[PDB]
């Protein structure tokens, strides 16, 4: 049983700017990934100081990239706070609309695609690599669920019957033909290194058989 959801038209522009301007510099995708996932984490962290049992569902705070090439997959998994269904409808829990006014708004004065994390959309990014994002998640309050969108207007929410998470999220990015060197590990190792030095989480680069 699968909905199928509009985006906001606003959001729907932000994809499509995202996706067709020319702006070589994509490897800042998996920098706003990384920076998400660690300020779910900082949130399970926070509620787990007055109430352990928050960490019931899993005590590791933690993030793990796992690239696949037969699937052409890049997956960052974290366990952090995860999201109910109601924030993945809202936008994966951000206040998109107006992060997108003013974002626009700074790339017609000058700022460009790099500083998107800046107006709390940096998940978006993920279209600068991916063809389609599936994104998996898991909140202490909720069921799992499975987003997913290829852009085009238009996104999908289900009940999520697969592997169990325990709770956080996983972003896996079905990336797009031209984009298959984060897919490579020392291309990964230089980006996490490069933008993601004070993330104060453990990031495990998983490697291929
Ligand atoms: C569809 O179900 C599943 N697919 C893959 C992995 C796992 C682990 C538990 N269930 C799984």
Redesign the pocket.
Known sequence: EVETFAFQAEIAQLMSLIINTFYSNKEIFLRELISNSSDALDKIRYESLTDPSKLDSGKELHINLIPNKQDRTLTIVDTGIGMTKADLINNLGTIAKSGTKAFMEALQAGADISMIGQFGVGFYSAYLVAEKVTVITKHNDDEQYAWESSAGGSFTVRTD????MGRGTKVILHLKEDQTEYLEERRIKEIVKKHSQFIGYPITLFVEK
């Open positions: 019957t697969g592997e169990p």
